[PDB]
A = this chain, B = another copy of it.
Amino acid sequence: KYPVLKDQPAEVLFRENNPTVLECIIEGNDQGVKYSWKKDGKSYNWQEHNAALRKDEGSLVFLRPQASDEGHYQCFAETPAGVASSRVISFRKTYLIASPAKTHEKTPIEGRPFQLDCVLPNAYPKPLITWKKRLSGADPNADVTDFDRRITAGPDGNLYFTIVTKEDVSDIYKYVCTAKNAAVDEEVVLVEYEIKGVTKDNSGYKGEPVPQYVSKDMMAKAGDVTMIYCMYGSNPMGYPNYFKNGKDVNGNPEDRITRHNRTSGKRLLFKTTLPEDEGVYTCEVDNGVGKPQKHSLKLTVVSAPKYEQKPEKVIVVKQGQDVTIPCKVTGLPAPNVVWSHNAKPLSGGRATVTDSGLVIKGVKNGDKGYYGCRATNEHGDKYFETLVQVN
């Protein structure tokens, strides 16, 4: 069609020393366009560095990225129409650093809350912690098994036994904690545990529910999946009740929000979070034994800028007519829009900024070019630009 940039990702991770590319393709008629990158604001001279530009595009390929290559990169394609711009792309280094897996033996007291600790590694992005009952000497792809309902992993990465019993003992299964992320191809093992036996309880634990883990106030992105945890150690095992500002909220195994997600009520799951879920959530654990326990949490839903009206890819107008580049953005907190024309700030002349778009009245020739709408807030930075081709 016309010379326009293809959309690109918000962030691109790279494994140190591994070749990675920062995309930048020109859709349509890409004749005589010159591409240039800018990093962290100042201009980037790739020729000088250890990088190269992909052939028929502006994509910058790092031949061996270093930690010092991290940064904010923006691309600019100079075309007959003007200067297209890419969103600002975040280039970060992905990794997972963990000390060698150490195997530990444990002999916990029977009928009493327990928990295996996991040593979270230094990594980015945040890794995925998984816990598994690992059969020894078996093949990696055929060694996992299931945990009782008494056992659940918290969002902190630890395994929680509401009460540990003798059935939790084994001479061949290991309680392993593993982590994986974009920096490795197969999960890494952080620590291993072996429950070899269980001591009898002399100091008679009553059974009163005691906090093992409980979610604190939190933020949540609308459309995301939220999980509020209420893990208590009780005897017998209790089923937490959940209330949103006082009203019941347990639902069923298949509602949007429910405590029935195979965790024995240890977790209230929002299959999908909405703004209306904001409120103070309370949970109560009563198991007969002792005083019942209560906990309060405030779920706050926030959101990255959302384009209720994505700028048009292209707008062709005739010298004279008035053009209206549409653009409406919403968000929480409210995003703040910044307009650009050919990669620079506006200039009072004819361009009128409304909340539903930009309006240029007396369209002359020097008005042609790319108009960019940048929506931003502490939860995201987005950018979409429309090429205004007049003639």
Contact = CB atoms under 8 A, between A and B. Distances in A.
A171 interface: no
Interface string A344-364: 000000000000000000000
Contacts of A269: 138
Interface in A259-302: 260-263, 267, 269
A55 interface: yes
Contacts of A64: 21, 54-55
A142 B153 contact: yes
A35 B176 CA distance: 48
Interface in A6-59: 19-21, 50, 52, 54-55, 59
B141 A146 contact: yes
What is the total number of copies of this protein in its complex?
A: 2
A385 B249 CA distance: 72
Give the dominant DSSP class at A's interface.
Answer: loop
Nearest to A49: B55
A117 to B, nearest CB: 18
A130 interface: yes
Contact of A263 (B20, B140, B254, B267): B140
A63 interface: yes
The 9 A-B residue pairs with the shortest CB-CB distance, nearest first, are A138-B262, A19-B19, A52-B52, A130-B141, A145-B146, A144-B145, A50-B55, A61-B63, A142-B145
20 contacts: A19-B20, A21-B63, A50-B55, A54-B63, A55-B63, A59-B63, A129-B141, A135-B262, A137-B260, A137-B262, A139-B261, A140-B263, A140-B267, A141-B146, A141-B262, A142-B145, A142-B153, A142-B262, A143-B145, A144-B144
Interface of A: 19-21, 50, 52, 54-55, 59, 61, 63-64, 128-133, 135-147, 152-153, 182, 185, 253-254, 260-263, 267, 269
